[PDB]
Amino acid sequence: MATPTNAVSTVEINGKREDLIDIIYNIAPYDTPFMTAIGKGVATAITHEWQTD
Amino acid sequence: MATPTNAVSTVEINGKREDLIDIIYNIAPYDTPFMTAIGKGVATAITHEWQTD
């Protein structure tokens, strides 16, 4: 009903390139405060032992 | 049974050395406020005497 009958419109065009941006939006947090706060150490066995007084 | 059938794992081996750290954690307090606050002096006898008025 629209377009002057035999009008060259976006429907008839072939080879229209798509537009996909090269950015992926990810904002999920992955911080580990407790693990960052505490210290590091080495274990040499399945069971790890220490002492208190 | 989620292990290879003929697999040498920590379950069946023997002679594993223990893992005992070389630190002893003691946090008991031993401060003496009243001793630090008051003065110090020398007594030269069994009985110490002074005067008031």
For residue B18, give the nearest of A49, A51, A52 by CB distance.
A49
Helix H or strand E encompassing B35: helix B33-37
In this structure, are residues B16 and B10 in contact, taking their beta carbons and an 8 Å threshold?
yes
Determination technique used: cryo-EM
* Contact (CB<8Å) A45/B18: yes
Round the CA-based radius of gyration of chain B to a whole number and report it: 32
* B16/B9 Cα distance (integer angstroms): 12
Tokens of A34: 């407790």
* Contact (CB<8Å) A52/B26: yes
Resolution in A: 2.6
